[PDB]
């Protein structure tokens, strides 16, 4: 089998990408954030309570002829940003682009943090990280990949986010028309339960190569680029005005500027991050300071190719035995 479904920005920044995704019988349709940093896939529900609901749609279990409470198991998660959610478990039959899975754990929010109320647009997540780091206790429960890696044709799957633009999420096969040149592959490490890899170096517009080791996580829930202060510092020292400031947090620029683009390495291939991929705007509505799109990873303890980075590539999510990461431009 294979699974094929449209992913599209929740704001004119690329803040996040939500993919629409059907639960129950009949179908409940709810856009989630499909997430390759985390493990749990959880909604807004019938049982969140009342005042944290602010527009999202909700995953009702009591209307869907397919839902089994999964009795005496609960979950809670915290995110990197500090963001958080709770609740109990259901299955259920989940959809995503036409592939189905059955017994599919959903995790049904009873508590969600402000930043998850504040944006209507996200009606929860859907975790693709490895299910090592899934929540639900007593008895830990498989990711919607995970579960369906048996039936796919491949046991992979890809994403191909746009830049101000819808793109795709595909499952169980390698689209060969949606990139240019070749797929290069990169060894992957589970040992942290994410997408961890080491990027080769990089390069600040057109600046000189650095061979230099990055290890990091492919993290599709991520907004921004996060390396480490060297590299930042590097690529900012580029863009006149351009500074770290304490108050905003973070790397802001004169939103007069021109963006130098930003090179990774993946083994001997280059990914070119376009300068405008970059601009995360102003600060403040009305400012003439904007926020950068590659920040420090310092006070995180890990780099985070988040999706200022992954837009600019096919990316392929190899879940063989040997797990790999392949990159191609596009």
Excluded: M
Aim: net charge negative; hydrophobic share 35%; glycine share 12%.
């Amino acid at each position: 089998s294979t699974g094929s479904a449209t992913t599209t920005p929740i704001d004119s920044l690329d803040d996040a990408y939500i993919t629409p995704v059907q639960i129950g019988t009949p179908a409940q349709t709810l856009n989630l954030d499909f997430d390759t940093g985390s493990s749990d896939l959880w909604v807004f529900s019938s049982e969140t309570t009342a005042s944290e609901v602010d527009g999202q749609t909700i995953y009702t279990p009591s209307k869907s002829t397919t839902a089994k409470l999964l009795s005496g198991a609960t979950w809670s998660i915290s995110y990197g940003d500090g963001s958080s959610s709770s609740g109990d478990v259901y299955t259920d039959t989940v959809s995503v682009g036409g592939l189905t899975v059955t017994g599919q754990a959903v995790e049904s929010a009873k508590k969600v943090s402000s930043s998850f109320t504040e944006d209507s647009t996200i009606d929860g997540l859907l975790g693709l990280a490895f299910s090592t780091l899934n929540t639900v206790s007593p008895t830990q429960q498989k990711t919607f990949f995970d579960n369906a890696k048996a039936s796919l044709d491949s046991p992979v799957f890809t994403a191909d986010l746009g830049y101000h633009a819808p793109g795709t999420y595909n499952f169980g096969f390698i689209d060969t028309t949606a990139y240019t040149g070749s797929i290069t592959y990169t060894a992957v490490s589970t040992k942290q339960g994410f997408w961890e890899w080491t990027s080769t170096g990089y390069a600040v517009g057109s600046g000189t190569f650095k061979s230099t080791s990055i290890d990091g996580i492919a993290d599709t829930g991520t907004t921004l680029l996060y390396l480490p202060a060297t590299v930042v510092s590097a690529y900012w020292a580029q863009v006149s005005g351009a500074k770290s400031s304490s108050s905003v947090g973070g790397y802001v620029f004169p939103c007069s500027a021109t963006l130098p683009s930003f090179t990774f390495g993946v083994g001997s291939a280059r990914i070119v991050i376009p300068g405008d991929y970059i601009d995360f705007g102003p600060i403040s509505t009305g400012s003439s300071s904007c926020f950068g799109g590659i920040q420090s990873s310092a006070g995180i303890g890990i780099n985070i190719f988040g999706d200022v980075a992954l837009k600019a590539a096919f990316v392929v999510f190899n879940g063989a035995t040997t797990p790999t990461l392949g990159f191609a431009s596009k």
